[PDB]
Design a protein around this nucleic acid. Structure first.
Ligand SMILES: [K+]
Ligand SMILES: [Mg+2]
Ligand SMILES: [Mg+2]
Ligand SMILES: [Mg+2]
Ligand SMILES: [Mg+2]
Ligand SMILES: [Mg+2]
Ligand SMILES: [Mg+2]
Ligand SMILES: [Mg+2]
Ligand SMILES: [Mg+2]
Ligand SMILES: [Mg+2]
Ligand SMILES: [Mg+2]
Ligand SMILES: [Mg+2]
Ligand SMILES: [Mg+2]
Ligand SMILES: [Mg+2]
Ligand SMILES: [Mg+2]
Ligand SMILES: [Mg+2]
Ligand SMILES: [Mg+2]
Ligand SMILES: [Mg+2]
Ligand SMILES: [Mg+2]
Ligand SMILES: [Mg+2]
Ligand SMILES: [Mg+2]
Ligand SMILES: [Mg+2]
Ligand SMILES: [Mg+2]
Ligand SMILES: [Mg+2]
Ligand SMILES: [Mg+2]
Ligand SMILES: [Mg+2]
Ligand SMILES: [Mg+2]
Ligand SMILES: [Mg+2]
Ligand SMILES: [Mg+2]
Ligand SMILES: [Mg+2]
Ligand SMILES: [Mg+2]
Ligand SMILES: [Mg+2]
Ligand SMILES: [Zn+2]
Lengths: 176, 231, 37, 122
RNA sequence: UACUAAGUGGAAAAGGAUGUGAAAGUGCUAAAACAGCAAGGAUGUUGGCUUAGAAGCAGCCAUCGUUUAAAGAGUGCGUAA
RNA sequence: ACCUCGAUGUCGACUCAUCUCAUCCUCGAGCUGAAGCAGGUUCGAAGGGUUCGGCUGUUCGCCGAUUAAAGAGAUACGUGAGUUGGGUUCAAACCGUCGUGAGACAGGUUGGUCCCUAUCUAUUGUGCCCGUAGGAAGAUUGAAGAGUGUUGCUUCUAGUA
RNA sequence: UAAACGCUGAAAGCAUCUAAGUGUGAAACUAUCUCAAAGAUUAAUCUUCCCAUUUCGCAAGAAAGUAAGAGCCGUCAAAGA
């Protein structure tokens, strides 16, 4: 079960301030803020190097929240301590991207130039024109950037053209 | 938005030949210097507008309440008072002319009261079709069109609200948009506006910034005749 | 996606879920997407 | 303004003396055809030594109009008879010569061959 | 005192569904349960007719046996095979 | 066979249209036995648009040429106190057929009277009175609303994917 | 927002667009565009102007006595039966 899963964290640099509805996690990287919805059916306890989430009742939403927020705390700590990264393999005949200031521009196949603004806290690097790496401290934010970059050219099944994900296989078709 | 407005009187229609070889019909508007009679602010009133005074007249042709207001505000007596929404940035008691408002060839829209036509029929009013004239016919030739929606208790049994029938036509405010200013005449205080402006010659006319193309200014220049003295 | 009054798995990999109070079938094969269960 | 079922003359060498309009090509309920417009027609008066036969349905472009049209400068071009020439898919004239004068509206809508084979353009 | 999350109540069938509550049995489990993860996952052989060919995955002749923890003439994909 | 026989005018056409979606075009998307172009099917969507002719009284229908498209229905198979009367169905006359006959035929053909000055309500416009709590002259905000919303071709992008 | 696609995520250690949280998304919807609109009796707001008498008694009382404005009438048409 996720709810009854240990969250053993070292006190070297990661602290977790527990307010009424504002959980703050600070560590090597930037600080992550989590909002607690009101009347949360789960109380945290903060021992030495161990946090344990317990519930009051046997309700369905109680169990659902107990699992979900244990996962959220795990993800916040990991991103604060070591971050998250996503890899996009942009592949094609004339596809290439590069970064200018805060906007990532791409030229896949479109007459109109394609540009994209980078939100705060995320760093996107382009080592090779066919490769994009999105590094951040919040999993959902880097995932939104990866998917919104993908939306311009979804990988087609007939050839390999598109903004593929790394180690992602697509079903091949033979268009004679 | 930043809406600019001026008031004038339409004097007639003419044409001018322009470079790029076009013959442009124009409307001529006599624009008196307008006087800002009041400014109404968004914070103090819940909306923002500018009310000007124009078409100046002598004090003996004005009613007592209006002349009292004019003498209280220290303004020139005028018989016409009207405002435009979202007009800001003008100090009270400042003379405004279209030269400071619009550019040489920018897009503006014009509102004016249409020419009165009186009690007109359905065909002249709603672009309806006339009934057949030959092959046998009946008393109603210029018929409005059957207004039946449903006959019987399970159907409407009534003429629907907002039906298209005969009635009053004309003497109604109408706006024509995206009209390009052609030329300014400072000495005669005379504005040239391309196209046709509604209303009879001598009626009031409101020139406003076009909401469709607020900042668009399409260049236009006139042609200089090359003809010389007879040889 | 195929809209049918009755939805059942076609291959052993098809999995039934309930999303937005509607039961659908999702699977690796896109020819087997069903809805309106 | 040539309209539906309008008899007009042919200003070329093809054997067709009188031609009748069938459709004002270009859109739905296109009421009239002005200078430069393309129409579908049927040959009604022809000659034995002609490339076309009576009754064929063909495509033509109008070059002259009695009503006339007004240009941008303000000049109103007005002929005294409605005339059309028979054209091919490529927009190339079917005849080898064009009789009489033609308008300038052809130049805008391509029809360069028609202008080069005319006597004088107006 | 329980139930419903559908405005069901406040109209409907054949059929479909990890919605939820109650009950009655049965299997394993701190001699470790289930899911997932990490490893192996075999040999004769690719058996043989058969099919251009099939030989772990065409129809067959059927639907083998050992080593071994386990392994199937295979679970599919897939390869002319 | 429940309303109507002290009368509910019945086909088609013209004018004016309104509504529904089981969508013809335009708009968005899933799957494809979807290489591209052009398609097939399903889902969402009713804002607008949805042609002119030949023959027939015709609805229907076949054909011709266009269009992005030439949608399916309902509204007393909408609409004659709005029009027409070609058709059906008065009296006249003939053909085929039936009848011994007078006559008869959802058999065929020629001809043949379509009334009403609007009281109430509904609707399109325009006024008088009064109210808005002193009166009058001006300028406004905008609760509740109405109107419009269609789309094609060419060039470039690019003979690039 | 519909169809559809999501990111992060459990109930159901996997998976999962959804339950919490956070997105994308159509000529449809609400506005942006044009017109009319305080009889909107729920009767709105602002500015300016004119009333602010003498007596008797009875006060949103009397006799006279006090202005802005409007109407009747006439000439008309940017209007109009
Ligand atoms: K009856
Ligand atoms: Mg008569
Ligand atoms: Mg008559
Ligand atoms: Mg009833
Ligand atoms: Mg009714
Ligand atoms: Mg119900
Ligand atoms: Mg079930
Ligand atoms: Mg149950
Ligand atoms: Mg009975
Ligand atoms: Mg009845
Ligand atoms: Mg009666
Ligand atoms: Mg009667
Ligand atoms: Mg009647
Ligand atoms: Mg539908
Ligand atoms: Mg809209
Ligand atoms: Mg004829
Ligand atoms: Mg019926
Ligand atoms: Mg009828
Ligand atoms: Mg009908
Ligand atoms: Mg019937
Ligand atoms: Mg009637
Ligand atoms: Mg009728
Ligand atoms: Mg009549
Ligand atoms: Mg009647
Ligand atoms: Mg008759
Ligand atoms: Mg007759
Ligand atoms: Mg008879
Ligand atoms: Mg006999
Ligand atoms: Mg109302
Ligand atoms: Mg996921
Ligand atoms: Mg949105
Ligand atoms: Mg009362
Ligand atoms: Zn499947």
């Amino acid at each position: 079960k996720i709810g009854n899963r240990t969250i053993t964290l070292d006190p070297a640099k990661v602290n977790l301030n527990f307010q009424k509805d504002h959980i703050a996690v600070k560590g090597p990287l930037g600080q992550i803020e989590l909002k607690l919805p009101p009347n949360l059916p789960l109380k945290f306890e903060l021992k030495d190097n161990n946090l344990q989430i317990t519930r009051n009742n046997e309700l369905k939403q109680s169990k659902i929240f107990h699992g979900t927020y244990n996962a959220l705390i795990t993800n916040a700590i990991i991103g604060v301590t070591q971050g998250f990264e996503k890899k996009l393999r942009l592949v094609g005949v004339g596809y290439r991207a590069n970064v200018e200031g805060e906007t990532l521009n791409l030229q896949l196949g479109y007459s109109h130039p394609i540009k994209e603004k980078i939100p705060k806290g995320l760093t996107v690097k382009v080592e090779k024109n066919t490769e994009i790496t999105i590094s951040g401290i919040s999993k959902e934010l880097v995932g939104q950037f990866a998917t919104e970059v993908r939306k311009w050219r979804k990988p087609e099944p007939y050839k390999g053209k598109g903004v593929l994900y790394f180690d992602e296989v697509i079903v091949r078709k033979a268009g004679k | 938005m930043e809406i600019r407005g001026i008031f004038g009187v339409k004097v007639g229609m003419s044409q001018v030949f322009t470079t790029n070889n076009e013959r442009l019909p124009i409307t001529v508007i006599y624009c008196e210097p307008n006087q800002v009679a009041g400014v109404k602010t968004e914070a103090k009133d819940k909306y923002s507008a500018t009310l000007l005074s124009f078409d100046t007249v002598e004090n003996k042709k004005l009613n007592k309440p209006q002349q009292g207001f004019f003498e209280k505000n220290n303004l020139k007596p005028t018989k016409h008072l009207q405002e435009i929404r979202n007009m800001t940035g003008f100090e009270m008691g400042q003379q405004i002319t279209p030269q400071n408002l619009f550019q040489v060839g920018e897009y503006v829209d014009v509102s004016a009261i249409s020419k009165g036509r009186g009690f007109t029929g359905a065909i002249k009013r709603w672009n309806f079709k006339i009934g057949p004239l030959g092959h046998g016919a009946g008393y109603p030739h210029r018929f409005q069109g059957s207004v039946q929606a449903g006959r019987g208790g399970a159907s409407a049994q009534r003429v629907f609200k907002g039906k298209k029938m005969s009635g009053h036509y004309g003497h109604e405010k109408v706006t024509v948009q995206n009209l390009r200013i052609v030329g300014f005449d400072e000495a005669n205080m005379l504005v040239l506006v391309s196209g046709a402006i509604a209303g009879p010659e001598g009626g009031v006319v409101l020139i406003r910034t076009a909401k469709k193309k607020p900042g668009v200014v399409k260049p236009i220049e006139l042609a200089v005749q090359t003809e010389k003295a007879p040889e | 996606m195929k809209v049918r009054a009755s939805v059942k798995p076609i291959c052993k990999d098809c999995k039934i879920i309930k999303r937005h109070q509607i039961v659908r079938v999702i699977c690796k094969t896109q020819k087997h997407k069903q809805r309106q269960g | 303004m040539v309209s539906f079922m309008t008899r007009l003359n042919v200003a070329d060498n093809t054997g067709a003396k009188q031609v009748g309009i069938i459709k004002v090509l270009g859109s739905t309920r296109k009421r009239y055809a002005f200078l430069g417009d393309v129409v579908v027609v049927s040959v009604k008066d022809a000659i034995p030594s002609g490339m076309v036969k009576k009754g064929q349905v063909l495509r033509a472009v109008i070059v002259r109009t009695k009503k006339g049209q007004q240009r941008k400068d303000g000049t109103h071009l007005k002929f005294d008879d409605n005339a059309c020439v028979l054209i091919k898919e490529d927009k190339s004239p079917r005849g080898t010569r064009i009789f009489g004068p033609v308008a300038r509206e052809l130049r805008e809508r391509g029809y360069n061959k028609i202008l080069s084979l005319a006597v004088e353009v107006v």
